[PDB]
Amino acid sequence: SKNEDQSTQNTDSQTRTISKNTSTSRTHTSEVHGNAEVHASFFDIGGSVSA
Amino acid sequence: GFSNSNSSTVAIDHSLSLAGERTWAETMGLNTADTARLNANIRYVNTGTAPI
């Protein structure tokens, strides 16, 4: 007779997790735009520079 | 057009959590060498002629 001791375990688990969260955020934005423009017509030519 | 830009977002959070749990468990242990125990129900019969 093999003197071996064996065991089986069954387990059930039901978990209810109720969670809260909150947040704030603060953003600060700098921006530097550029522009150049060359217009041309039959007899009218222009140019423009912007920032 | 040539547009540069630069932002900076500063944030903060608080949080709660309420976790309720109910756990059921069952276990059956056994030893293969000692599975069962015996018990006999027996009588004694004298069919002879002298008592013992």
Author numbering:
A (entry chain B): 272 to 322
B (entry chain A): 323 to 374
Kindly provide excerpts from the paper associated with this entry.
Following assembly, the anthrax protective antigen (PA) forms an oligomeric translocon that unfolds and translocates either its lethal factor (LF) or edema factor (EF) into the host cell. The toxin functions as a binary A2B toxin, with enzymatic A factors, lethal factor (LF, 91 kDa) and edema factor (EF, 89 kDa), and a cell binding B factor, protective antigen (PA, 83 kDa). The first α helix and β strand of LF and EF unfold and dock into a deep amphipathic cleft, called the α clamp, which resides at the interface of two PA monomers.
In our PA7-LF channel structure, the LFN (the amino terminal domain of LF) binds two neighboring PA subunits, one denoted as PAN, which binds the N-terminus of LFN, and the other as PAC, which binds the C-terminus of LFN. The cryo-EM density reveals a helix of LFN bound in the α-clamp site, indicating that this site continues to engage the enzymatic factors in the PA channel. This helix of LFN in PA7 α-clamp appears to bind within this site in much the same manner as in the PA8-(LFN)4 pre-channel structure (PDB 3KWV20). However, at 4.6-Å resolution, it is not possible to determine whether hydrogen bonds form within the α-clamp site between LFN β1 and PAN β13. Upon alignment with 3KWV20, nonetheless, β13 in the PA channel and in the PA8-(LFN)4 pre-channel has a highly similar conformation, with the first α-helix (LFN α1) aligning well between the two structures. This alignment indicates that LFN α1 binds within the α-clamp site similarly in both the PA channel and the pre-channel. LF α1 is angled downward towards the pore in the α-clamp site, while the amino-terminal end of EF α1 is elevated ~2.9 Å as measured using the carbonyl groups on LF Glu34 and EF Glu24. Upon conversion to the channel conformation, the carboxyl terminal subdomain of LFN destabilizes its interface with PA.
